[model samples]
Target chain A: TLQFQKNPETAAKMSAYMKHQFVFAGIPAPERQALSKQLLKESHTWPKEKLCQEIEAYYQKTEREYQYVAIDLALQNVQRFSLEEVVAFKAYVPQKAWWDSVDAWRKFFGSWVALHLTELPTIFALFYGAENFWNRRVALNLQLMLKEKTNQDLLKKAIIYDRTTEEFFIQKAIGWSLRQYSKTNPQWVEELMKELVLSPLAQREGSKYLAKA
Target chain B: TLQFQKNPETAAKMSAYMKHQFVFAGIPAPERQALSKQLLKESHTWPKEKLCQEIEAYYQKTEREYQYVAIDLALQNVQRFSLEEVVAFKAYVPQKAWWDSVDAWRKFFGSWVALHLTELPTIFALFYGAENFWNRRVALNLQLMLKEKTNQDLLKKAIIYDRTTEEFFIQKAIGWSLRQYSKTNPQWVEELMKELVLSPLAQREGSKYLAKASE
Candidate 1:
């Protein structure tokens, strides 16, 4: 990390490509992984006492990847986040809303789901049909990868509420969710597609495994 | 770089020793470099296009100091090596490959000689008889100071030890060792070159201290 730097051309183009919705340091992923591997290696630890403030500091940056640092910081201890911190985390969800950073939520949210299975319904409800598609997107597919242990009723509620939305990402997310689940229970996916009016994108992608069948 | 079948015991102890946190295959330099020199030698016959890829295959491993051997191979024919290959090479150099593997960079035989002068004959024998060819090369030359204290027969045997390698450093060491001895006994250096097939570099360098014996 800290040892690597970004160039102006890439930074401007990457900034523009994200519709200039956010500023960027333009650290390419390969170089980011390379230097981040070295950067994090310098200290095996982020001192627990000062960590939250440091993460908060990173999330406040105008450059997009500072939020990446903060996201990675939360991921370092996904289960450790308190319910209040989780609730207050909404400030970050739509702050500089774009799929680039927001799309990563399901992974961290999945861990939170794993650790707090009993609170599953309320957690999904928090974002299930909120105003921003990003939040709703998290609500829709937080259990995208939980497989057999997935909370079936909450998933059905979330999916049934959001599947009719015309957002490309939302529809694509719907297809991705069904496709991921298809690995564990293809019958349920086919059954759901027959029972629901999936978007054309969702229906095509969701029906892939059943096509294989 | 054709090296493998590591002694994991070597790996375990070596890893723990250097666990700060670069790791190694724990094989000594000789066993590793020997095959590298040999393979690149054959690569001298390589159709220049397929060449760099061969060195790269060994470089991708976690015991990735294989890059040194990769470089050593290319260095043999470095005259023919092009520019972009040189540019791409800067990536692997110690500019930061990982959190570890910095078993670098030097040593001091003088203090070693001072403290262990009493054990020189035995230690030199062990160095001469060691598994690594480079160790034998060390045993051949570690007498840069032994003016008359030089072990004459030991010098002869050490020269015989590296009788085959065109290894640049080994030949250079051979040259320096012979030159060191030449100051004490010019006849000895002259006689050895008379019959033995030393490298031209060695022949010139070893004969440097002898008065016009510049062949």
Candidate 2:
């Protein structure tokens, strides 16, 4: 329903905005959101076991909206998945690859792990061990916006694992995660920097709001 | 909290983008949306009298995001506005004084009038004769998305009322209203063009969808 409102010119601009990485159905936020409300109001329900199938179907559909819906559904309904089931959803990450969608998926995973604390170490372990850049990127900064509840040891450990890499997205995520953490504890980054080496992008973006120490 | 997240560099570019008409908090949509959800989850509520007050406060605020909040709120709660209640919000028109905000408000008014189709004649009378150009412009475009539902007599009447005028926005709006209607019924606009003298902008904008009907 959300994908029907394609504004080609607008979608082209949006496509260009995302650096020509993918095609957009041209549905800007206001109209897209209105349709989303309509769909939700209609109680459009999808089953749990076919979660990956449905999300992949939408991801495969024309325009990026289905990908957005897949993320939207998870954010609103992660509890519908059992612990074994949710892990499979992570493997679908690389298909609809974009910052916005990936970051939203992070919120979904991060919040879910936070709620089911028993799953944290395992999730982190799977994420860090993966060679896919997106998975590692997710591992490095999943704690963003988690505020004081962020697991300090795991965050540092994740960063250290990818600290030497040069992938731009991973580096940016590293900086963004630290930059957020700095808002709560600037001194922590200041101390961590004393012993660790960060790439130029990571160091620069992460240290933006700091005292310049 | 949406107002608190400021990025100085992003704000400067945004300010310049809007021709420096207003200051900005530098927050963009994704972040703004994330925060909007958090606030809504907290269950913020406002009564009508308070609705006007809060809107007025946001409009009175220096940054453009506040104005953004005002539009966002209206779109979300337009149904909450009984028709009689929506008319009172028109005073917000000139405060915004720019295309995006003014246009959004027009959408609010337009949708309200559309749903209560009975209000069309009275609202058009009130709007067409409005002293403010923006109000008249709203009258010009109130039926924009109405398409098949568009009232032909009222539309022609509103266009002819401002027909001789040359205000850029009003002229552009006249063309816009016809252009939008054209998508649903190009022949209607094509036939109307035989009798009406539309400004170049309007003809150009409104008739691009027509098949080389006019030179």
Candidate 3:
């Protein structure tokens, strides 16, 4: 993890793929994760405060992979994070946002919330009511991995509460939550699609995993 | 200004003088200030928000001179800063702590406090009550340049409240505050010296500008 093997060639293509929204270290996911495996293991021994501090330190770096590394560390330490720390972590959400980093944080928060389902509303509302769409997007997709455990009422409210937005990221997020939930209950997703008005993009993406019959 | 002519030799000595508490860019005061003068002038036109953001950005850098550059920009735009911004600025006081940067910040805050004198307690208390000595030092020295207008009660409370602490910085700051105030009111410094208990270092340093009894 100390020395990232940077590739100038791939860095350009990766930056282009991200529409140059962020700088790349030229290392793709497989290599980046493999290199970071030991560091992640070592970080498990760190106190919650140090993990949070390192997350901020890494996020501030100029290269984008460092952010990915921070996300990985956050995900690994999900169980150790307390609900109060979300205020600090939430501030990081909109700073260097892109689908890449924000989506990764969405996954991290989503999984963390699953273990503390009783605190879902308290936690989710922090993002749900935010002015930043990146934050709203995080709220919309918090249950992506919950599958059968996903609370339909909360999920439905999370989607319909913000489904009308024209922001591509929000529309895509709405579609993503439905498409993901469709895996567990496709009929529920299809009915919700009919019941609610949505962006054309949302309708199409939401229908991605639904059965036509 | 864009490219600092880094002298590794000077950087080492400078860092050494600060007891290696920070890394230096090897830029001396004269050269660094000369190079950054244009940027300082340009920053005066910045909105308060941008000025604060740039201050945080510059302070985050590893090299010590960047912090100096931030102080210069802050000193340049003192009139534009609002008292409410002190919460954000005070957080920077304890970070990267060393006398050079902290003393420079003391000067900046001291000057900023001078303008909004009515808000002095509201602003000064934020630092005075802080657990960090660097922050307490900022509180003690807030009126460093406020010679005639210096609030003696607040100054006395600030020094006496923290006078017994063994930290060199705090003791020296106590001494420096009195010594600086001595130039304007040597008699006040002398009277206060006789009235309060103080460390020998503080008493010695505080007595520097006081008049001789025989003279």
Candidate 4:
């Protein structure tokens, strides 16, 4: 794989912004994507296991941009992932588990789970039972883009399950999931507010769309 | 609040058997139950939180026998546990998560989830998504005693999700869950063996009741 251009000056700032949790290639997203254009396009023709193996290798890289590339490759290959393959991908959530990595993986899972609605129970259980809070965050947002297809009961249960969770990421996930769902059904979010207690952060963030509507 | 007699000699043997994962109070089941009889009998009148609180306290004790007492108290109070409280009780699963404690918690969850069938998805999701294999172990067995009430699809999914796990306890849980369910629906187990690839241990254990049924 061709490596990205390294700029230590920019990498330092980016690394600092992420609380120094990860190192960077110093290449920005667009530049990195442009640099990897041929690879990304070629990845589309790759088989499931090949893409999975590539993503695993990318995750092993020390530079954070490689992980971002891994996430992009995963997103590009989302349609190719079978139901069994989706659970296997959960290994990435706990790796480098910051908001940057976790949120991207959440998007990957959201797309995969939404496309396979019938497997909601099986797929949802895999993350909902995860001891890792990041995995739980993915569970809350699995129905993120489902809109009308969202099972309100499941959404509510996901929130209620972690209402007492004190993790900042989880609370933000609760709010973000609710806020996203609120776009489709503000009234349901309204009813949810009355029935359940949410962290102040979640309450405020969840109420964003509702308050405006 | 009464304490049992500590038999150091027996306690040493009990601790050795569990690989010294926990200390023992040198008390056995019948004797422990006999000693705790009055409290267990009187506990039925206690409200949900009080029984839960007592169980929490029991879990905090260092002696392994206290955990056994905690399991018995939980069993006695199973019907009293509301659906919401079931998730709350999951906190105890990882406390002393050896097979003895984990398996006992599995029975407690099996009873509770079975009674509240409608809440199956909600409750099942709680443990099924658990990162802790012990919690996942509980998820696999939640329908353990449901007999006719079991959902074969859910059971199969549970086994498949964990089929790749190398953990002996998880493999045993897969086998045990399948074995127990085989009693109610042997054909399902027979078919499961044909479709899904299970660990050799799981296959042997899962086939136990089925093999006998064939004869």
Candidate 5:
């Protein structure tokens, strides 16, 4: 009889394979962390293709149970392997297959990428203006990490493109990001409110922070 | 030539209309006070309907150019209007037409109503479960006024309803309200957060306030 529970290496292999298949499934962070630790320990020495295969197997087993979490972990591991690899992987995931997962990926990976500000202008030029709502959402939300200490030029660039758009998530993000920054400097915010050509929704949402202040 | 700018009654009417309109629009108090002195004299009063008409017309003309100022003026006027009138007026605004405005109204008027808790349960209940996001936002926000003095039942009710709902605005409001209350009673917030089944976003957002309060 096969001992599925006792063998750590086999368990690790199983987890990684399961991970790829259910990449977009919603598993809690703690559970994902546990699986991730096991997979990392066992797969650290595995070649990239082998790692991808194991993750694919894992996904094949648990895909239906935790689709969102599966996608999140896959993106995480893909980034861990190589940014280019993850980008390629992203191209493969169907649009509807990972909408929510992509949103999480955007917040996690997008912000991680944004911390490297020099790379942003070009990256944003490519992704920020993408027609996909998820791509646009990522572009807008990646700025969340830049709160209060946000780079003005970068924000201005993002705003120039995003200002005229009417997407609900995008509008909320513009307000949310600006409102957060306003908390750090009310006067600057007041000036922005006065000078910027923001949409009414964006203006109303952003100004609320200052209005309260 | 009609001097809309010169008539004291007109200005008051404008101010009153502005107040009602602003509060419904979710204007904060300090901003409203600023508008009180800048745009018009503090003592203005006009018939309620005319005030509403003027504000509606202004919104049409400017779209959202003056929305912030307008929201501010309306919030301040919540204090100026009789409680009964404010409640009735709030009840009349269509749920969606003034979503933001209602949120502002709740924050200001809700606080006012909270202060006079003995006679206002009916009003509080209406706002507490209002379908509009702003109305719900105000319900959570009003608790900010209650803080240490927050009625136990009201706090429980808010937490219960808010925990199950995933509306981002509601989550933010609940966290904000709880975090403010936590400032006065850290132990209570800690215990409540631990026991309550709050959304992860709410937990993260609200806990920041608790941390700030502790610091």
Candidate 6:
């Protein structure tokens, strides 16, 4: 038998209620199993605000719970709507409250943003050099899905702006994204690695992708 | 000026002494680096046995003090030595005893082994499915370097075997190696990812390569 019945309106209401209760109560495995199926269904219909409400409600309901579930649902549904939906949902969520959730959101949003490259350039430009590490990380990692054909000018901007920061994650992403590009043109990465004087850790971590391969 | 003088004989003797000390003291790095300049000199002259002796001595001196310096040195010298010397050096290293060192060895040895594909299938077979994770990782990872023109069959074997395993690292290496191959032949990888029932992690990890390239 199917784990949970698929009903859009009922699922949405149940999801909203669960978001409220899940904050304080342990969602039993059987209920979570059922919730998983229902959430996947409701994910398609819920507008950006409703989605945000559910997320905030979940956060308020259980200040500490299976929080990744909330973000994962956001990721699964965020892809369906426009970039504006994603930006709005992100705006509603508290920044420092959920780092892992934010990271997963960034991964999903960055890749999603890359898919609509032409529309992204200007919007992304505004945040490309933001002081927020999460914003900087999103900019670096967004191109993870875009690879070499990425707007190099955009990447060059990010690289030049963040080049001096020793933020390990950002550095790793920079090296990783560039190294992935190197698969297409090793010479380009080799030249950049030589000229940039990348941090030792970034150079070593990033070089794994390009070294001798 | 170079950090260390280039003296192969002195380097080899110093490497021998450092290995002895590593065995006796149960710590490799502090001691090895303390004698870095001297060890670098002696490392240049260490024949396979002297090198292995240093490793074995360190292992005996303090089993927990494992470091891949000796193997890394041997692999660095692979291009300088004869094939016989390379083979003799590899013959004695314990399986998985010096995993990091063995992986370092594969960086050089894998390429060397690729050169004699027809004659070295037995050796390739030994490493291809070994129980060791680093060995398996190096085998698949090095094939990415070897490229399709060099050993299509070995690459094929590695891809297929990697797809079957449950190991996270191997699965990741398989996706990575395949993704690297996709840069040159996107159609092949696109088809492979589509046809295979890959782990979610593999699909997500590997898809970035193609998704980045897609028009």
Highest DockQ against the true fold, candidate? 2
Off by over 4 Å in 2: A1-213, B40-44, B213-215
TM-score of chain B of 5: 0.66
lDDT, candidate 5, B65-137, per-residue tens: 2444444445544433445655665553343344455555566566556545553565657667777766667
Each model's lDDT comes to: 0.66, 0.74, 0.83, 0.83, 0.56, 0.57
Native-referenced DockQ of model 5: 0.01
Q: Write one digit per residue (lDDT tens) for candidate 2, span B133-195.
A: 888888888888787888889888888888778798888888898889989988888988778
Off by over 4 Å in 3: A1-213, B1-3
Model 4 Cα lDDT, one tens digit per residue, A95-116:
9889999889988887876766
Q: Each candidate's iRMS in angstroms? A: 24.0, 13.5, 19.9, 25.1, 32.3, 29.6
> Per-residue lDDT tens digits of candidate 2, residues A1-213?
345766789889999998988888787767766777644322223334354555666667767776777676566555445567668778866766778677777887887777667677777776875778888777877777667877889889888888888888888988888898999888887778667898888888889889784
lDDT of 3 by residue, A104-155 (tens): 9888888777867777787688887689999999988988998998888878
Question: If you assessed candidate 6 against the hidden native complex, which CAPRI class would it receive?
Answer: incorrect
Candidate 2 residue-wise lDDT at A120: 79
For each candidate, report its DockQ versus the true two-chain complex: 0.01, 0.02, 0.01, 0.01, 0.01, 0.01
Per-residue lDDT of A55-110 in model 5, one digit per residue for the tens? 55554453333444345445444323334554554442334333345566566555
Model 4 agreement with the true structure over B103-140: per-residue lDDT tens digits: 89888887776656777777778888578998898888
lDDT of 6 by residue, A57-157 (tens): 55443323345556656656543445565566555233533344456666667655655556567546645777677677666656656665566667667
Candidate 3 residue B127 Cα shift, in angstroms, is 1.3
Q: Model 1, range A88-174, lDDT digits (tens) per residue?
A: 666678876788778765666767767667667767878888898899878867887788987777777777888788898888878
Comparing 2 and 5 on TM-score, the stronger one? 2
For model 1 chain A, the run of ten residues with the poorest summed lDDT: A38-47
lDDT of 6 by residue, B99-194 (tens): 345455666666655544443555556568766666677667665655554354575577677787888777887777676777677667788778
Clashing pairs in 4: A128-B129, A129-B129, A129-B130, A130-B129, A130-B130, A130-B131, A131-B131
Which ranges of candidate 1 are over 4 A from the true structure? A1-4, A37-49, B1-215
